[model samples]
Target: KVFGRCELAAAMKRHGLDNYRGYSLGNWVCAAKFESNFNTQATNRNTDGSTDYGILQINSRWWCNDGRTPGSRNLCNIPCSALLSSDITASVNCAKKIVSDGNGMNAWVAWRNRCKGTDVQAWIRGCRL
Candidate 1:
């Protein structure tokens, strides 16, 4: 049961991801590329100078500001830093979690369309990562 692009395609063929309009393996890869250059463990301080972590760049301050600590084992259920983990695989899984969500993928598709005309952004969006 592979779940990455190739595997996902096979599974979707067996089942379906048809609700995913304008979404493709290319789009998924592009979303991750745009989000973190495929660095599963990527982390960033937010624009306002707070912490965001993991592949999807989920923020710790905004999502999990008070109760759970930034890299806590229970972070997955929390809003902030939802994918923050010492494990790179866990981080990538975190990204998959976000991208697998219908709305999030749609947002990525929208972002992809918006950036298509720009070279740098297009390269980022078209990257095989």
Candidate 2:
């Protein structure tokens, strides 16, 4: 499912992403916007021959396991299929885990390319974070 701007923010907040890891909810909201446009089923194939799954695009390269990816570290210890769901529990959990894995928000390319070092206040303007 695709989410409205504020709707996504509320969802992230419900998952406790607001101000998580010293990164604002706006950062997550913005990353969600720029990464997958809030589509829970969104997936991408990277040039490095890997896949990114779900709203936050958790990568098959290291985060989620996709059976035979070979490079799948499954560091997040989750199945990639589960990340691509309207039920975002696994996605959010893996997102937190991904950030906490020493890379911070820099783990997501979209976050650095599009959301990094930005105010992103506009991303969560209508949400109560």
Candidate 3:
């Protein structure tokens, strides 16, 4: 599913993630925009032979099963493909768990490289929340 910024914000708010792990919804929104552009079916193969899945770009190296990546930690104990669904609940839950494990949103390279220290409020601009 492809979601607009407002739609994504509303969904994230509904999922109880307006402010998660000390990061505001704008942070998450910014990350998602840079990570996958809010496309639930998004996936990307890394140069290291691993792959990222879903809107948040959860990696197969540590978070989910890709079947091809060796020595996967599978901390979420879910298939990476499961994250491709339009329903973002599972992805949100997994992301929450990942951030709680430490490093906060820094776990996402996209957040660090793009969203961090920037005006993330633009990500949720015009959203009624």
**Regions of model 2 farther than 4 Å from truth:** none
| Model 3 misplacement above 4 A | none
What is the C-alpha local distance difference test score of each model? 0.44, 0.88, 0.91
TM-score-wise, the better of 1 and 3 is 3
- TM-score of every candidate relative to the true structure: 0.43, 0.93, 0.95
> Regarding TM-score, does 1 or 2 come out ahead?
2
Q: Give the clashing pairs for model 1.
A: 63-80, 64-80
Clashing pairs in 2: none
User: Residue 2 in candidate 1 has what lDDT?
Assistant: 12
Tens digit of lDDT per residue, candidate 3, span 1-129? 999899999899899788887888999999999999999999999998999999999999999998999877899989999899999988898999999987888999889999999998888889898
**Which of the two candidates, 2 or 3, achieves a greater TM-score against the reference?**
3
Q: TM-score order of candidates, best first?
A: 3, 2, 1
Number of residue pairs clashing in candidate 3, backbone atoms closer than 3 angstroms, sequence gap of 3 or more or interchain: 0
